[PDB]
Coordinates of C-alpha atoms and ligand atoms in Angstrom, one line a residue:
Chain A
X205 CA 47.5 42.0 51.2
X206 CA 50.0 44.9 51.1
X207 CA 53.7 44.5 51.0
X208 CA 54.2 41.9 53.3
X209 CA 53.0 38.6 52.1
X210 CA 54.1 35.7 54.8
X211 CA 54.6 32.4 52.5
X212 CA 54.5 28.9 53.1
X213 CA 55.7 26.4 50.3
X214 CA 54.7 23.2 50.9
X215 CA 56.4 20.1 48.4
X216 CA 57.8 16.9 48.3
X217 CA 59.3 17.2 45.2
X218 CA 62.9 17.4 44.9
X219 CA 63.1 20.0 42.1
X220 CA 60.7 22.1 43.4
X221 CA 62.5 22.4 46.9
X222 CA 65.4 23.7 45.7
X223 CA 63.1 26.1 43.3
X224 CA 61.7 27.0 46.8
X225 CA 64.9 27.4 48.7
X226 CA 65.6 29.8 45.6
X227 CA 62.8 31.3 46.2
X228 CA 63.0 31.8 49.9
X229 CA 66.5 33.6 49.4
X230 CA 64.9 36.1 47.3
X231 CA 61.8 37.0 49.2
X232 CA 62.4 36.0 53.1
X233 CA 59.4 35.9 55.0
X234 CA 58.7 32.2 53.8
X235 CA 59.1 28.5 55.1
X236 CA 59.2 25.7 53.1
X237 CA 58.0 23.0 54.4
X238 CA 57.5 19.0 52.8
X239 CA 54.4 16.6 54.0
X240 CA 54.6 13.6 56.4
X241 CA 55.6 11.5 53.5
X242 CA 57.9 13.5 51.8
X243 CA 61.4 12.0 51.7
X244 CA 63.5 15.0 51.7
X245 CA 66.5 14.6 54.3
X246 CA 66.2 17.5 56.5
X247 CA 63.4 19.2 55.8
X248 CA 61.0 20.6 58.0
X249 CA 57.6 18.5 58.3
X250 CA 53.7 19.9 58.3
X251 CA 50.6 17.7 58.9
X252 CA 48.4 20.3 57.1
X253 CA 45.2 19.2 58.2
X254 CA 46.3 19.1 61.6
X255 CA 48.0 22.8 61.8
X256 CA 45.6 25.0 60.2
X257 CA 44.6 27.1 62.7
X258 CA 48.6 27.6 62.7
X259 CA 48.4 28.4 59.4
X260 CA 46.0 30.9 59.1
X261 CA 47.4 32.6 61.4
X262 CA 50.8 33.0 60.4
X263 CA 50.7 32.8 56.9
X264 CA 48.8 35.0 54.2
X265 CA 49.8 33.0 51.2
X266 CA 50.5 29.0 50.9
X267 CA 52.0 28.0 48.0
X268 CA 52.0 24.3 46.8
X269 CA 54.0 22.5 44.3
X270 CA 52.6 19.1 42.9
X271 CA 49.8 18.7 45.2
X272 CA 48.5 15.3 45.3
X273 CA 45.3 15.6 47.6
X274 CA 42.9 18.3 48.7
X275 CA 43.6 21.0 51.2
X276 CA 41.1 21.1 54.5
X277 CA 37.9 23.1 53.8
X278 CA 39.0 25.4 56.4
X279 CA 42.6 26.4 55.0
X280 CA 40.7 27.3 52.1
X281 CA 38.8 29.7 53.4
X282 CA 41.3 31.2 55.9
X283 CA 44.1 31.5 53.4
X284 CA 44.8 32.0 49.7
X285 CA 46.0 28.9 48.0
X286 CA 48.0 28.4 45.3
X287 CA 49.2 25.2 43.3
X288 CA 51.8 24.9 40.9
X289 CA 51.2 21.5 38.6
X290 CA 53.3 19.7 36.5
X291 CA 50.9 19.3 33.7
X292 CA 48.8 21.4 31.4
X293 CA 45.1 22.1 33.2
X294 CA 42.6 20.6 32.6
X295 CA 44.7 17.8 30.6
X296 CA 45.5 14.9 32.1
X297 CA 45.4 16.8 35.9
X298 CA 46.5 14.2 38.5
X299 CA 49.4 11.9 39.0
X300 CA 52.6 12.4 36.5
X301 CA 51.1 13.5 33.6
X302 CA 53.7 13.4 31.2
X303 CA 53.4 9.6 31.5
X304 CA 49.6 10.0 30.2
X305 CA 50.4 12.5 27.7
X306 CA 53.1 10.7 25.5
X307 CA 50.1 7.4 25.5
X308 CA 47.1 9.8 24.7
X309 CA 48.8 13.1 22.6
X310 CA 47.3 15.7 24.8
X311 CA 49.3 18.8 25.9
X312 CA 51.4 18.7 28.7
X313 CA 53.2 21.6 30.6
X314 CA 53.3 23.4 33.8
X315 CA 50.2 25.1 35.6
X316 CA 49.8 27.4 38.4
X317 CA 46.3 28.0 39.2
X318 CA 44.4 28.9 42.8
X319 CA 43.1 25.9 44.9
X320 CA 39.8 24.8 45.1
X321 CA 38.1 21.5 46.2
X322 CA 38.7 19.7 43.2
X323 CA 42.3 18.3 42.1
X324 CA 44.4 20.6 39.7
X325 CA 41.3 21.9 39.1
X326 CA 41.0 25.6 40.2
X327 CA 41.1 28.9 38.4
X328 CA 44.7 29.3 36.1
X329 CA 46.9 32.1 36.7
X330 CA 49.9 30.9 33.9
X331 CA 50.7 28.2 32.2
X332 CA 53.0 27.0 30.0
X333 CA 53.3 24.5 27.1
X334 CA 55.6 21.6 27.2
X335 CA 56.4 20.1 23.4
X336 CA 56.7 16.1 22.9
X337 CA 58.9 14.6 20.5
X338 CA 58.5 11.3 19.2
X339 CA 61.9 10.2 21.0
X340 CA 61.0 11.3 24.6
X341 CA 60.7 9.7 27.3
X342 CA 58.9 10.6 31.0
X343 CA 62.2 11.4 32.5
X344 CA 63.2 13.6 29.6
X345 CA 60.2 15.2 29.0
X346 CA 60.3 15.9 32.7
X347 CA 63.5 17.6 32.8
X348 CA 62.3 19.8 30.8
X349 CA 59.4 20.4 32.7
X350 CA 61.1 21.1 35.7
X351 CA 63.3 23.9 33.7
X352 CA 59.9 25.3 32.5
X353 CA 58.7 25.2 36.2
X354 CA 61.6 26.9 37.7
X355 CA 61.0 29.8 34.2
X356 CA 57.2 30.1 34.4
X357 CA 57.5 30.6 38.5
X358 CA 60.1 32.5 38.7
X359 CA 58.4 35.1 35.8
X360 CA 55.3 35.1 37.6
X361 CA 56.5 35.8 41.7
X362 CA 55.6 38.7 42.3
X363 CA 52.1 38.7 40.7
X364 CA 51.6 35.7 42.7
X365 CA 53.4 37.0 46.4
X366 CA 50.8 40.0 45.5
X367 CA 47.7 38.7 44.4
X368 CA 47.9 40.9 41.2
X369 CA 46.4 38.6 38.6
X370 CA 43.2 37.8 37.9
X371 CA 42.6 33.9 37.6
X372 CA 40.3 32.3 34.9
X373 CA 38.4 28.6 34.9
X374 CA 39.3 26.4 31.8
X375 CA 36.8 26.2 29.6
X376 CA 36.5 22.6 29.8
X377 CA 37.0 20.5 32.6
X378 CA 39.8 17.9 31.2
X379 CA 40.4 14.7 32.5
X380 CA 42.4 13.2 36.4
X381 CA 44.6 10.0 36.8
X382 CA 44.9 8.6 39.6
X383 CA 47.9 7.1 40.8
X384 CA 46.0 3.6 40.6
X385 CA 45.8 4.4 37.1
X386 CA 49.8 5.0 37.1
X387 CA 50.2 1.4 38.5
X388 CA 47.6 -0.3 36.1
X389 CA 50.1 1.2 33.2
X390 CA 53.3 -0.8 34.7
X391 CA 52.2 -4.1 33.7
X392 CA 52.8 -5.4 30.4
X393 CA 50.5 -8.0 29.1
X394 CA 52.6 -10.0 26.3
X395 CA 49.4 -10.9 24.8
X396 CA 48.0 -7.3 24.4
X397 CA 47.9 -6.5 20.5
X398 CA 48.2 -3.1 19.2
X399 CA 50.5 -1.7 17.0
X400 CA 53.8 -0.9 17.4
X401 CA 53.6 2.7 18.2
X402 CA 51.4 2.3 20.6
X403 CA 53.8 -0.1 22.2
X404 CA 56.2 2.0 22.0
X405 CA 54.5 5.3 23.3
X406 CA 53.6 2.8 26.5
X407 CA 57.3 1.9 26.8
X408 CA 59.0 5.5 26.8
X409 CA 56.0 6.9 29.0
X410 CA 57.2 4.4 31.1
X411 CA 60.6 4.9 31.2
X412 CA 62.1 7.2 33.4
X413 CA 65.5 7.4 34.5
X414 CA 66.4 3.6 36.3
X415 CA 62.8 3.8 37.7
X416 CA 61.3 -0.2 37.1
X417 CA 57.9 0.9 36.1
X418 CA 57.3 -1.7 33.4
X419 CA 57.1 -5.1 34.1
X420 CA 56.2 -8.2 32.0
X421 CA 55.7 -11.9 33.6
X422 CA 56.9 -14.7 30.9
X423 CA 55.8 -17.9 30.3
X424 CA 57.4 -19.3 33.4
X425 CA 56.4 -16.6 36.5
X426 CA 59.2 -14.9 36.2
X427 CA 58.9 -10.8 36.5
X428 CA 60.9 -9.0 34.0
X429 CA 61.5 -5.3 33.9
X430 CA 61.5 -3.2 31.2
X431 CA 62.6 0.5 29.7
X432 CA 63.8 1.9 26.0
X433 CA 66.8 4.0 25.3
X434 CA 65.5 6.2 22.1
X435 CA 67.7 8.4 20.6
X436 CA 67.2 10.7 17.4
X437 CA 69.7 10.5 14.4
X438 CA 72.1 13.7 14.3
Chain B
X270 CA 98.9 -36.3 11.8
X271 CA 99.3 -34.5 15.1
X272 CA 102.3 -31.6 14.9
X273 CA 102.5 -32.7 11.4
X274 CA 99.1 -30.9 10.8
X275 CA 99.8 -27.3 9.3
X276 CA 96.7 -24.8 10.1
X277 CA 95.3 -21.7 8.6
X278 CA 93.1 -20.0 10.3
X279 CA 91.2 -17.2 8.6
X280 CA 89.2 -14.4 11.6
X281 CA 87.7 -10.9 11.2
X282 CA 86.2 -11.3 14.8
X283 CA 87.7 -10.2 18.2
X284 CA 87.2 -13.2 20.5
X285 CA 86.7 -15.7 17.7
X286 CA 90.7 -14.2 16.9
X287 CA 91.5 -14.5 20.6
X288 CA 90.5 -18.2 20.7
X289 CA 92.8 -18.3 17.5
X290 CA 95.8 -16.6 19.7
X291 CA 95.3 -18.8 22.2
X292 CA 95.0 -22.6 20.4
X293 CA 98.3 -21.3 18.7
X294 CA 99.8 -21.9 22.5
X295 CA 98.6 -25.5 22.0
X296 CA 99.6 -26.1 18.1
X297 CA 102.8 -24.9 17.1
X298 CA 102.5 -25.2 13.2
X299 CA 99.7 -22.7 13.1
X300 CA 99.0 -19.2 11.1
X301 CA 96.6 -16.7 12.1
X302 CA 95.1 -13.8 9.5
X303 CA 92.1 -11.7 8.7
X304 CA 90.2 -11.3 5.6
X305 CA 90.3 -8.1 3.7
X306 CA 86.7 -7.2 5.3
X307 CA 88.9 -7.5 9.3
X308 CA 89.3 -4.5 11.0
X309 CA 91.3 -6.2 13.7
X310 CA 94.1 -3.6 14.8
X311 CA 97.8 -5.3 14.4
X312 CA 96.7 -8.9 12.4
X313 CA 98.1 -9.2 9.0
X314 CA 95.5 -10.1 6.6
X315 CA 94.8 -12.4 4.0
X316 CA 93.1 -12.6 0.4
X317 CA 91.5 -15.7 0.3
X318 CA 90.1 -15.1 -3.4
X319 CA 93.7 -14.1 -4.4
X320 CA 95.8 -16.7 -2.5
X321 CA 93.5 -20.0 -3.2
X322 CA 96.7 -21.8 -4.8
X323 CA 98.9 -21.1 -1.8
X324 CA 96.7 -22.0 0.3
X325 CA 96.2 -25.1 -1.0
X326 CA 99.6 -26.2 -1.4
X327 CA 100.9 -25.2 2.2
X328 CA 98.4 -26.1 4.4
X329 CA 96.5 -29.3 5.6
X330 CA 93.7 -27.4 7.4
X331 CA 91.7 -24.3 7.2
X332 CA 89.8 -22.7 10.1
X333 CA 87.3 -20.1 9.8
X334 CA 86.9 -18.7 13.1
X335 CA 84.2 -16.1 11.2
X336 CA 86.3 -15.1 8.5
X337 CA 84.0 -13.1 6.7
X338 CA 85.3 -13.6 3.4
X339 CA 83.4 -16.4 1.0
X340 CA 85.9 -19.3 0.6
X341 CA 85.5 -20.3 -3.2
X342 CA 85.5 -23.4 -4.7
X343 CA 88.7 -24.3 -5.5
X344 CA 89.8 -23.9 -1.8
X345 CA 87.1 -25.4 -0.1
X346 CA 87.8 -28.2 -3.0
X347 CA 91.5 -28.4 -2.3
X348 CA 92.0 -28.3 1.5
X349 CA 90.0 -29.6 4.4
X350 CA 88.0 -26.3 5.6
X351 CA 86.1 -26.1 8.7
X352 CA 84.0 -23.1 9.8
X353 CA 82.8 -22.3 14.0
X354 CA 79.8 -20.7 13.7
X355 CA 77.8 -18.3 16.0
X356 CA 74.7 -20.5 15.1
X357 CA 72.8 -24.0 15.4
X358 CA 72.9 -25.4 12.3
X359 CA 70.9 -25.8 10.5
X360 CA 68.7 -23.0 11.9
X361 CA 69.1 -19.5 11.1
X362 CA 72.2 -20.2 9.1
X363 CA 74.1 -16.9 7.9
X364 CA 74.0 -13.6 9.4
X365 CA 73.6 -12.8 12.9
X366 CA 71.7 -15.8 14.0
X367 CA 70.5 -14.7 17.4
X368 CA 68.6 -12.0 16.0
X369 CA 66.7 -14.1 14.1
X370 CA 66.3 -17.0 16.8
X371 CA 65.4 -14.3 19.5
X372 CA 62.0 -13.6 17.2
X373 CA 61.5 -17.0 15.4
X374 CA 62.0 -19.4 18.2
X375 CA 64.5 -21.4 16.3
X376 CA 67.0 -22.7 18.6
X377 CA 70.5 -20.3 18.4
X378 CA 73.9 -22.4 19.4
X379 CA 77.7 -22.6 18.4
X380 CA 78.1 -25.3 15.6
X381 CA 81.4 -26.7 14.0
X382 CA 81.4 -28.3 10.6
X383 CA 82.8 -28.6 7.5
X384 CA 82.5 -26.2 4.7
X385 CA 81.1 -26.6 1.2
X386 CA 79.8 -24.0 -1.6
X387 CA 76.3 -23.2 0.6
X388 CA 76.7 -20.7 3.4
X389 CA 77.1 -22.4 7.1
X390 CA 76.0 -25.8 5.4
X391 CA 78.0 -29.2 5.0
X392 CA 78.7 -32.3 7.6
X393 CA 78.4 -31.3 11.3
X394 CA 81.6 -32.3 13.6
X395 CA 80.1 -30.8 16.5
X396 CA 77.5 -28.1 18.4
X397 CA 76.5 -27.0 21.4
X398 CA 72.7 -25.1 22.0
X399 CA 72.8 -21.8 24.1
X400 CA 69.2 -21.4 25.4
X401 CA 67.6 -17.6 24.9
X402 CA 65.6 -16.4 28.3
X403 CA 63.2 -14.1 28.1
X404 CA 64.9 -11.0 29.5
X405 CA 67.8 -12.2 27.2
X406 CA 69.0 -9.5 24.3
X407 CA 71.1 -10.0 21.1
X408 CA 74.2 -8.9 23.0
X409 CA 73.7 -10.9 26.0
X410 CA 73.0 -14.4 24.3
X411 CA 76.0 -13.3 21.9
X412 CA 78.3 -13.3 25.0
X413 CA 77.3 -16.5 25.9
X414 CA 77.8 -17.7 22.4
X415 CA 81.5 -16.7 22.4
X416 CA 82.1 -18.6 25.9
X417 CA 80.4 -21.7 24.2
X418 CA 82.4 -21.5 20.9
X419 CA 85.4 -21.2 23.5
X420 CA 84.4 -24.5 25.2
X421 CA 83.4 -26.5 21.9
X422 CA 86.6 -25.8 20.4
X423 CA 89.0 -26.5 23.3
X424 CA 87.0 -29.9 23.3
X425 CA 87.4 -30.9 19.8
X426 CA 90.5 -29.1 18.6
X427 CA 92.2 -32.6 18.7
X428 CA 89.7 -34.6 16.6
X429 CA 89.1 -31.5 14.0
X430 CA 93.0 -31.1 14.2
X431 CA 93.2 -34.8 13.3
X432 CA 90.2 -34.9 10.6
X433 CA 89.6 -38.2 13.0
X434 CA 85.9 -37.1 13.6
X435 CA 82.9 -38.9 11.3
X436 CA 81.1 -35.6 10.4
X437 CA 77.3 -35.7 9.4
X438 CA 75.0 -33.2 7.9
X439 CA 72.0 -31.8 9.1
X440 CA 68.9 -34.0 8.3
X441 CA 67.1 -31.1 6.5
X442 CA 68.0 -27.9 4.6
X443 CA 66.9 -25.4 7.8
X444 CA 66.8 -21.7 6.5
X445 CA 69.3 -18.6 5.3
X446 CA 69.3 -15.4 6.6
X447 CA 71.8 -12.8 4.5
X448 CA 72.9 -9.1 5.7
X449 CA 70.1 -8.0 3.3
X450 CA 67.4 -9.4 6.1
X451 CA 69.1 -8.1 9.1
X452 CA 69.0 -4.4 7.1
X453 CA 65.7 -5.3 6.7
X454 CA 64.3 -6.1 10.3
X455 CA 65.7 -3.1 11.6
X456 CA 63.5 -0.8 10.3
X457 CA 60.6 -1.2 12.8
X458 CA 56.9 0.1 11.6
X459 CA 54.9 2.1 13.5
X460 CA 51.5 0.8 12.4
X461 CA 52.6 -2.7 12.3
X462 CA 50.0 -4.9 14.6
X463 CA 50.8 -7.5 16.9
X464 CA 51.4 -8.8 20.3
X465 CA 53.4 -7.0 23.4
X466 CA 55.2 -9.9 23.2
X467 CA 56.1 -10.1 19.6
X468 CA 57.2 -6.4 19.7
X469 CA 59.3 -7.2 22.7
X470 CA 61.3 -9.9 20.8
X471 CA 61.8 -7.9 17.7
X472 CA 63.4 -5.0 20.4
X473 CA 65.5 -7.0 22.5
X474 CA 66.7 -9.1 18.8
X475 CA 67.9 -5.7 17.8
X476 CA 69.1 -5.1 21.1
X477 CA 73.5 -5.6 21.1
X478 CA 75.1 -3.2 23.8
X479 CA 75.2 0.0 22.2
X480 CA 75.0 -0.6 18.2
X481 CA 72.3 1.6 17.0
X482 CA 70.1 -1.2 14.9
X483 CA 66.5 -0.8 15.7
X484 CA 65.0 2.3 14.4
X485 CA 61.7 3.8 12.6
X486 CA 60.7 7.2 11.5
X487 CA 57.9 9.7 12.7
X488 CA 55.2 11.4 11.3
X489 CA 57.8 14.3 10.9
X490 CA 60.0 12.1 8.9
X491 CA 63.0 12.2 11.7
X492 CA 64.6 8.8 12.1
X493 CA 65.1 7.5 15.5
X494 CA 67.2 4.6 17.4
X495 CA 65.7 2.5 19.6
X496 CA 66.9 -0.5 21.9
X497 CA 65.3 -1.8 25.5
X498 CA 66.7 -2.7 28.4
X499 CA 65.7 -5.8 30.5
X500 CA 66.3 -6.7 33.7
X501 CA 64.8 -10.3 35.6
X502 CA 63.5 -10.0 39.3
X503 CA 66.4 -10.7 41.3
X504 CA 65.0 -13.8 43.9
Ligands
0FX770 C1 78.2 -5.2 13.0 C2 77.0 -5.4 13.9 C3 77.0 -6.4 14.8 N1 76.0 -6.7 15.7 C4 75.9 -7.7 16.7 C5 75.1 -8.9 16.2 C6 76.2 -9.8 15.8 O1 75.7 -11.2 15.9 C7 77.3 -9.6 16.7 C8 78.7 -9.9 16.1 O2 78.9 -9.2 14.9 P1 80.1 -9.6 13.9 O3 80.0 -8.7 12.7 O4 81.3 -9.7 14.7 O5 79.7 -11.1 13.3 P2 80.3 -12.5 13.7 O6 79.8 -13.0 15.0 O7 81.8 -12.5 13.5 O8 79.4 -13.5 12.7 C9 79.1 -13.1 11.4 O9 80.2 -13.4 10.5 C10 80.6 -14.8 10.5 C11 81.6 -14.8 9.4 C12 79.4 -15.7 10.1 N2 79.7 -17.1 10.2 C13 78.2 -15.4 11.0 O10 77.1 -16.2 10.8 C14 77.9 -13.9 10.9 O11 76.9 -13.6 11.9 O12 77.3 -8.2 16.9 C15 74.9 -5.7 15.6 O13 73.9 -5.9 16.5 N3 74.9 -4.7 14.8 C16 75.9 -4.5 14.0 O14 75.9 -3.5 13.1
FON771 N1 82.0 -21.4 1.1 C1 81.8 -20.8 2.3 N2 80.8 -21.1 3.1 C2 80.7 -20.6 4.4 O1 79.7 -20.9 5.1 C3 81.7 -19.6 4.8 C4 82.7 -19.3 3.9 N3 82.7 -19.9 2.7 N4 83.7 -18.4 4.2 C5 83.7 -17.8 5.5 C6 82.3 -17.6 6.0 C7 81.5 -16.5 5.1 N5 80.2 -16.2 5.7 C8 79.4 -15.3 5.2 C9 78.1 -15.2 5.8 C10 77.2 -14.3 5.3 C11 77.5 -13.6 4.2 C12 76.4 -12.6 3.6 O2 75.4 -12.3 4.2 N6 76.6 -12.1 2.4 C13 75.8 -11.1 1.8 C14 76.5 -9.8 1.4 C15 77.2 -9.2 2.7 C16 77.6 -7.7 2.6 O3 77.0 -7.0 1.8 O4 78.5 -7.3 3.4 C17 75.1 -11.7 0.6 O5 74.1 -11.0 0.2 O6 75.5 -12.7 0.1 C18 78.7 -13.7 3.5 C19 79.7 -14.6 4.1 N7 81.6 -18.9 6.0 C20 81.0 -19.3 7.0 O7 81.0 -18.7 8.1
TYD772 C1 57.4 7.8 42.3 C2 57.7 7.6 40.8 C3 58.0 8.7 40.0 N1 58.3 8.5 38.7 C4 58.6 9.6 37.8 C5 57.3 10.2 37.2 C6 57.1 11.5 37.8 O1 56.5 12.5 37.0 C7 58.5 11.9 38.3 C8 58.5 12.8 39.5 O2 58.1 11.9 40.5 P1 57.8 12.5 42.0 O3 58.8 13.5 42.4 O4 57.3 11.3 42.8 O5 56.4 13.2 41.4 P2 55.9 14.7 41.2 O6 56.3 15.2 39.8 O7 54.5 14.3 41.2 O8 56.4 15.4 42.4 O9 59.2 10.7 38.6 C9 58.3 7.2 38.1 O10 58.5 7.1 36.9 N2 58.0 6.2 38.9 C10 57.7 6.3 40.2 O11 57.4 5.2 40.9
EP1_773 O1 64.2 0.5 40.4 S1 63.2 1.2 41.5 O2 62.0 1.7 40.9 O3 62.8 0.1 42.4 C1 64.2 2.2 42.4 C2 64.3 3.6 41.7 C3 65.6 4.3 42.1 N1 65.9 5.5 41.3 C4 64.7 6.3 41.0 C5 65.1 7.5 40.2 N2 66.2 8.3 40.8 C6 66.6 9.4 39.9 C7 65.6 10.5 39.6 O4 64.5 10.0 38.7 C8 67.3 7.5 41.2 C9 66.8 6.3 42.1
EP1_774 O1 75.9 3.4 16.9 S1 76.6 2.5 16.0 O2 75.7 1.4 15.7 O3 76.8 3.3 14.5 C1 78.1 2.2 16.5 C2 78.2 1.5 17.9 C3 79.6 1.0 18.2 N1 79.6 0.2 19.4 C4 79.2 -1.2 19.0 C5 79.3 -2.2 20.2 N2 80.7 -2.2 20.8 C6 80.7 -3.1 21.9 C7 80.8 -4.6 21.4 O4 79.5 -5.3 21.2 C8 81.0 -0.8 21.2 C9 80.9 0.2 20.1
CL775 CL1 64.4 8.6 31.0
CL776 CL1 45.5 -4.3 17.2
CL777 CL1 72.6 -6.1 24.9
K778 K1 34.6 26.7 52.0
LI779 LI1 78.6 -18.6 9.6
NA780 NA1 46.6 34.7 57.4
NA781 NA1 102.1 -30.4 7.3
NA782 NA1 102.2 -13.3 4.9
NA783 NA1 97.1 -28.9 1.2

């Protein structure tokens, strides 16, 4: 690879743009680009599996942050590819895992591991641990998350711009939501019984900023939406 | 007996003391306190317990626009006394009634009527029911409770004025709730079992803009608040 790695960041994600824009500042020869669903005003669009001949070409590192789908076969062969994942490989890999990880108690944290054909899947580079407490919600344990992102990436550039780790599987092979498994969470069935932890674990890992991802229907049709406000005692 | 009718009216509550300020407007021989337990900035206050024979001897009417001071014997014997209260008698008498209405079902309402030695008990001049939605909260039914007990009182401040009213009590005995059971309900249980729905109600009971009522404790043994927000789908 040598001393001058060509980058290209590829996210949708609002906090990990402006990580990348960071990013780009410090080491130059990079472009950040979003997808052609991203909605961040102003940035510069890729159809990845329609520019990869492009890519190859130009670029000797792409570097992803949250990664929903696979790459093209043959970007992963022309190209080093790396992901950075908002959850903690192999736990609950997939769509916002945060929300799965304050209903089921496994770890969650940030991941950067290589690419392969399966999602947040591939070998792990670093990773770092996210703790839960009992009064967090998705959007604050996400915050955090972010902070841990922008730490973890930022200690771990330059091993990554120069291919000087050496990656390892996990052990085990964990467990992938879906973002259809995201939407089957949102609705509230008022005759559900459980206890009320449980209810309450589903209600906070719902509950994310003014996001209405929780809805009930009452007795008469009509759709309610629903989030907690949790605060510990100081 | 019209003008002639000389009013006391005993409130530790912000709009119930409003309501107060404003029938004063329309009755001129009229005296507004709080209790001892008030914490109403500027009002001078009131010993009911002390002041019984005053009382008594000066005026022809007492109000208790949620006075939260007990009105003993001798004063509810002496003097015509008349309590508004945040509830639908004779439901969920006593402390915080929505809260309790919210979870039981029981209907939740304004009611006017006269007072005897049993708390919110005694012959019913008037009420008015406030129906409880399901995106509804403590606080939000509350506010509507204070706009009813606005509109029931401007409608029979003449008649309960006059005493000219023919008062009746509730058929049966309903139920009591005291501060105790409000303390009580707060404290939610994390292995207690039961519906989505019956969890929801308990939440949105102990739900009252930003008062800090519902809470439980972790496995770590840290306590920790707890209230929902609700919002209908706007057609
Ligand atoms: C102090 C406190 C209040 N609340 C909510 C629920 C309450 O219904 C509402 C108003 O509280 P409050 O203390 O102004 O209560 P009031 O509305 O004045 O009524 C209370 O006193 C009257 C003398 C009695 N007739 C009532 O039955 C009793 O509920 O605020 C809370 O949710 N938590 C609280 O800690
Ligand atoms: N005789 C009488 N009957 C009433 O219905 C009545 C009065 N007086 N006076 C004003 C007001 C008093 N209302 C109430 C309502 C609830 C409690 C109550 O829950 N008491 C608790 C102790 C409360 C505390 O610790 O702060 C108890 O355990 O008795 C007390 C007074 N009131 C109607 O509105
Ligand atoms: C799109 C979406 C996100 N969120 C929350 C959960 C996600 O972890 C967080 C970030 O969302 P987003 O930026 O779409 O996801 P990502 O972290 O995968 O880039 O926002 C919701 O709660 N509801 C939603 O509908
Ligand atoms: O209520 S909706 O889910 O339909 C719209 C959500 C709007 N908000 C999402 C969260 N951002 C803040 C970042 O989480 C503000 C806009
Ligand atoms: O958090 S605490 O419950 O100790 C105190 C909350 C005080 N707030 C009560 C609600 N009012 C608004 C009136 O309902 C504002 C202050
Ligand atoms: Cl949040
Ligand atoms: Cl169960
Ligand atoms: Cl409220
Ligand atoms: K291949
Ligand atoms: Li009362
Ligand atoms: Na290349
Ligand atoms: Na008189
Ligand atoms: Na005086
Ligand atoms: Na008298």
């Amino acid at each position: 690879q040598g001393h001058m790695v060509t980058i290209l960041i590829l996210t949708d994600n609002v906090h990990a743009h402006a990580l990348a824009v960071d990013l780009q500042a410090r080491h130059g020869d990079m472009d950040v680009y979003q997808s052609p669903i991203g909605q961040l005003p102003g940035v510069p669009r890729c159809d990845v599996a329609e520019r990869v001949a492009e890519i190859v070409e130009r670029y000797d590192l792409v570097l992803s942050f949250h990664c929903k789908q696979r790459f093209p076969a043959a970007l992963i062969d022309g190209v080093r590819c790396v992901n950075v994942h908002p959850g903690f490989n192999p736990y609950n890999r997939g769509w916002f895992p945060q929300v799965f990880s304050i209903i089921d108690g496994q770890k969650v944290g940030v991941t950067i591991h290589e690419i392969d054909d399966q999602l947040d899947h591939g070998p792990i580079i670093a990773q770092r641990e996210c703790a839960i407490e009992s009064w967090d919600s998705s959007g604050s344990v996400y915050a955090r998350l972010m902070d841990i992102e922008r730490e973890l990436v930022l200690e771990h550039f330059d091993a990554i711009r120069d291919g000087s780790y050496t990656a390892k599987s996990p052990a085990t092979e964990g467990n992938l939501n879906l973002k259809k498994d995201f939407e089957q969470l949102r609705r509230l069935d008022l005759n559900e019984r459980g206890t009320f932890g449980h209810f309450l674990n589903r209600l906070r890992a719902l509950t994310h900023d003014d996001f209405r991802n929780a809805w009930f229907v009452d007795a008469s049709g009509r759709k309610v939406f629903v989030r907690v406000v949790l605060e510990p005692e100081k």
